[PDB]
Amino acid sequence: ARAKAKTRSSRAGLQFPVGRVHRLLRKGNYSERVGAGAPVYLAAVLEYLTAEILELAGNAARDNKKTRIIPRHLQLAIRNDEELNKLLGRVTIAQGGVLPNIQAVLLP
Amino acid sequence: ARAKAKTRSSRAGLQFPVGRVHRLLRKGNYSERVGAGAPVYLAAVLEYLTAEILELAGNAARDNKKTRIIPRHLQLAIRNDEELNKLLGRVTIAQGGVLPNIQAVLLP
Amino acid sequence: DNIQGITKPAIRRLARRGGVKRISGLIYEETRGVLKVFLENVIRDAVTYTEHAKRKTVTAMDVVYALKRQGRTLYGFGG
Amino acid sequence: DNIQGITKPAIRRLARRGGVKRISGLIYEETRGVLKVFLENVIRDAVTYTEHAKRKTVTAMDVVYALKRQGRTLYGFGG
Amino acid sequence: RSRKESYSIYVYKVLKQVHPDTGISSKAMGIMNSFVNDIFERIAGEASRLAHYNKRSTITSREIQTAVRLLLPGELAKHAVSEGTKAVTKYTSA
Amino acid sequence: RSRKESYSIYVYKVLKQVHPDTGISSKAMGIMNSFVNDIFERIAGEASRLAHYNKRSTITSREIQTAVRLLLPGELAKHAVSEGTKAVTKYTSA
Amino acid sequence: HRYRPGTVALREIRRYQKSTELLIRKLPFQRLVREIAQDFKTDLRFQSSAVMALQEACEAYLVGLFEDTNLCAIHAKRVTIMPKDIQLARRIRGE
Amino acid sequence: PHRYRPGTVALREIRRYQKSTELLIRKLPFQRLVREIAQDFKTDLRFQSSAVMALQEACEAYLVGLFEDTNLCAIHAKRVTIMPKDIQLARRIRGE
DNA sequence: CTAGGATCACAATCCCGGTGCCGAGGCCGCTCAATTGGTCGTAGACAGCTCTAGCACCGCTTAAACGCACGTACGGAATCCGTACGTGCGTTTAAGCGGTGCTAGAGCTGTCTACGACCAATTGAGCGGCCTCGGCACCGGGATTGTGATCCTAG
DNA sequence: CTAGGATCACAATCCCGGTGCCGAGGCCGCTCAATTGGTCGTAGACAGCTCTAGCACCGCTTAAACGCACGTACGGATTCCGTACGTGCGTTTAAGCGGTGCTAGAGCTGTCTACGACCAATTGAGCGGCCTCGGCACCGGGATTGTGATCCTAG
């Protein structure tokens, strides 16, 4: 009898699907061959980024006394961080609105 | 004895290399399969665009009493045609310079 | 004249989200023109995508793609 | 002190190609800063490409690629 | 009918790791799916370009690392690379 | 000795067709090579995306045509499509 | 009681900058979209989510433009946006 | 003797430099700057001559474009003198 | 009698407790895509070698940068006018919502065939290398354009 | 006596002619990459069916748009000042060019091994469907923040 199936995600201690990432790379017309480490690395990077943005959005929600993340919270989190703003510069978050910003010259 | 080799450019009445375009498409990680007509179409389009640019540059050279096309002539040809300028909007032509343009408000 | 459906108060609301305090009377027509140009461009690319798929219904994915290729990536509608 | 090598008359020449007639005295430092930022960005990406190839010499193709990925495609140096 | 794959399950796992008592709306889940797909494409495409430039046929962890350095700004890259490296190490030791 | 392929011969042929008495400098030839490579990779990339969106594995003349319509502005696309169509027709009749 | 010019304008700025709802009426926008699309292909249908996506993109674009128009006005020592500010913004943006 | 009014020589220079295509930054100082900047990323870095030329071409194109947008901003504020606040505005609107 | 601050009116916003609804999160069945184990071929890592071009230095010429003097025109502040955008009340209109009905076409499935990949052979087109000559850059002189200002003129 | 056009002195730029040099265009050898001929198989074209989701219409109910009016404050024109930037000249400096010498490292070739593709069997992870219930949006009504002006006083 063979060994119990152990997912590549679990071997790497990741939540993101390594097998799926591998398939998407192989079938995405990117290269002829795909190394064994490429899906692991990519999955880890995508998991880190989503953890970061979820953490910041949850913080914004908590600051707004809310328990569910909505697009507004995602926009607040993204626009208030210089690095995430620079990464997501040309991205429009649906139902995100804008940051409260009034020019100092307009105040009474 | 087989038949004399006839290039796919000559069969299509093209100056651009259909065979080369086909090879570049197959080995460029674009798709799994490449149709027989794709290289012909692409080559024809490339040829047309090249002809257009070269014609406009030669005209600029002839207007400047010159026999050889230089980067300057190419820049002039591209920036003086709205459509070619739009296509090559975010492109910098080395040693091309700029179009003579002085704001009307600055004139004596 | 469906362009007139973009009313004076809609444009004022859009300006107020943009932080504009005072608005000239000539802004409304300019804005209408700008919007028309933008829309034409996006719709023309979305329809091109639709026609390539041999479909008769513009899908949200056609729009998303059109925006993407124009450098105006939209998040929330499947990509 | 090599940023100072971009002298006042060089900046004036660049402005004159840009069609500028009158130049404030404070423009030179601003321009130097802008150029520094731009250069840093491009060189950073070119060096990244160089390091990936395990090379010790920055090639013109590294620069071309760096410019390309920043939306400043350069024609005339092999791509 | 039929399957449309998405990253919902994995987004929800990560959210439960970082905020156990915080949920997420369907519209935010759609935003997070679009985000993950977009970043995936950006990284894979730059790894592909890197590979092609150097006349290589295999996308390895090195290509991914370089792409991450090129795409992610500042400290994001620093931490992302660290995360990726740790994962690879753990994976290589099973 | 390392051979580097380029479009020089074909750019010169076309020039000689449109301007028999006009030559071209090496720097202009480099500009025209860069141009041809750039437009090639724009068109091919768009055709690839189109194919992928529709879950197709083959790039055909239809994909190229659509990619031309999407990329080339205004009348450029009208004439380019015509040129491409003529070539395919001529090619199909050998 | 009559509020001085500007008070209500700032109150509206705060209100709309705090909210996220779409500000253009749906039915007129849909009509505009369909009218524009008519010139490209006849008898076109539209998914509800296609129209919503278009509206979202258009609104975002216009808000961004108004922001850049406002910066231009402030730089010309004005507080009123004018067509010349939109034109300048667009020119500099590359549009 | 003869003195040209302010503006005459400035317009003559505009015409001359807009008609010519030569590089306007001295090569040796630019090279030094490039090497100084690259030094912070990796040591003992060599540079192809065509790498430096490419950098100089890109930088000069970028700066010319920026000066053009700075000039438009100045003209819109009813000035003829470009000032740091014009460069800043241009860059902000450009997204830089 | 005036300027400034104190005080007042009261409109808009925020906060709180109560209602209730419909979307998010969890559970169950299934199915297909990920895993395991083994085979095989070739892509790239590593070693070694060559030869090119990038770096360092020196001398000489001269073009460009620099510093200073002078003047003028342009940015900026101040004042006044007036019009035209803002705030608000009243009337109108059509957006929004809920419901009903029809049908077009998007999505899926089954079958088949033809179009593209792969292989072997072969051959000619294109690339490196060498070579010559004429097109353009430069220098010199001259004709012309243009700026700045002194002069004569009609009024 | 002026504003205006005419005339002038002068520097800068365009134009014509001669010289020369080095880059461009052509010829040659060969080699490798493109063409010819054939086979195999699976991807896409075409036909048929389903049902979903788009389109069209109708009736109330307000919410929002349109219109008009009174007025203040913001845009814009005009004037004056002073200083900061343009223009020009003499001095200094270091850029540009040529020539030499050297060696690090880029680029290529050959071997071989480890690693990634591929296939068959297995199965458990992930997707569709159903359901429940609690987080949220909404409402009424008080407490609070804020704008505007009326009142009071020392000055």
Residue numbers in the entry:
A (entry chain C), B (entry chain G): 10 to 117
C (entry chain F), D (entry chain B): 24 to 102
E (entry chain D), F (entry chain H): 31 to 124
G (entry chain E): 39 to 133
H (entry chain A): 38 to 133
Manuscript text:
Histones H2A, H2B, H3 and H4 are the protein components of the nucleosome, an elemental structural unit of eukaryotic chromatin. The H2A–H2B and H3–H4 heterodimers are formed by interactions between the histone-fold domains, and the histone octamer is established with two each of the H2A–H2B and H3–H4 dimers. The nucleosome core is composed of the histone octamer and approximately 150 bp of DNA, which is left-handedly wrapped around it in a symmetrical manner.
The cryo-EM samples were prepared in the presence of the PL2-6 single-chain antibody variable fragment (scFv), which stabilizes the nucleosome without crosslinking.
